[PDB]
């Protein structure tokens, strides 16, 4: 590349993200006073495990659909083969959502945005997967301590997705090429904005891997308990990525 082509890539990725970010950051920040009441939290904890798993599946799918559309708009993604696009989305889609989720997380009171209001981790107790919940909350807490800008999130999420190490890639070298370009774009933007201090503080790739693994493990535990629920009421896309 050259210095001009990289900056062009920076803006194009940032643009691709803005157009697919699901909810504007301002919208999430404006809603931070909107916290579930004690009565509403109890209401969430009173709901059945399966209804609650169904609801999380549906919201997860919504979020992922924006990541699909982000990838489609991401430069060079559509130039890869149909096999590789699918491989990259099966492994990285959930990881990208995980990173995006820190936008909806409030580090002051340790709450997340969920169904119109903010609630802490006790809200999710009916799911019967407290270790996963804590992990997700810890992850978002650790990301929020980085004070990510939207542009930074755009560029870091591009990289999470465009990962040339994923098993099953047919045109590996072609994916290595794109990865390196986005790496340059990210790192160039960090240099230019004096924010290279964050390179050291980004979580290891094995941390995101661990979270997604935990998700699939907890889902298989749940599916064994309620097979027909997953069969009949879970989103097809979610089933496709996760079971």
């Amino acid at each position: 590349a050259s210095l001009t082509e990289i900056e062009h890539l920076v803006q194009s990725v940032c643009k691709s993200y803005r157009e697919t970010c699901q909810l504007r950051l301002e919208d999430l920040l404006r809603q931070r006073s909107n916290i579930f009441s004690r009565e509403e939290v109890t209401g969430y904890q009173r709901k059945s495990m399966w209804e609650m798993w169904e609801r999380c599946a549906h919201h997860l799918t919504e979020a992922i659909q924006y990541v699909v559309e982000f990838a489609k708009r991401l430069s060079g993604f559509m130039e890869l083969c149909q096999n590789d696009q699918i491989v990259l989305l099966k492994a990285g889609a959930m990881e990208v959502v995980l990173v995006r989720m820190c936008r909806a997380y409030n580090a002051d009171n340790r709450t997340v945005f969920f169904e119109g209001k903010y609630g802490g981790m006790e809200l999710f107790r009916a799911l019967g997967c407290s270790e996963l919940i804590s992990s997700i909350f810890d992850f978002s807490h650790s990301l929020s301590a980085l004070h990510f800008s939207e542009d930074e999130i755009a560029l870091y999420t591009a990289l999470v997705l465009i990962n040339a190490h994923r098993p099953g890639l047919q045109e590996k070298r072609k994916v290595e090429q794109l990865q390196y370009n986005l790496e340059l774009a990210f790192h160039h933007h960090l240099c230019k904005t004096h924010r290279q201090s964050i390179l050291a503080k980004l979580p290891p790739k094995g941390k995101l891997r661990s979270l997604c693994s935990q998700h699939v493990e907890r889902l298989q535990i749940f599916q064994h308990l309620h097979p027909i629920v997953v069969q009949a009421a879970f989103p097809p896309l979610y089933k496709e990525l996760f079971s």
Binding site: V68, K72, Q82, I86, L89, P236, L237, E240
Partner: peptide, 8 residues
Amino acid sequence: KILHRLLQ
């Protein structure tokens, strides 16, 4: 299945 449809 669904991924293919979303990408086309």
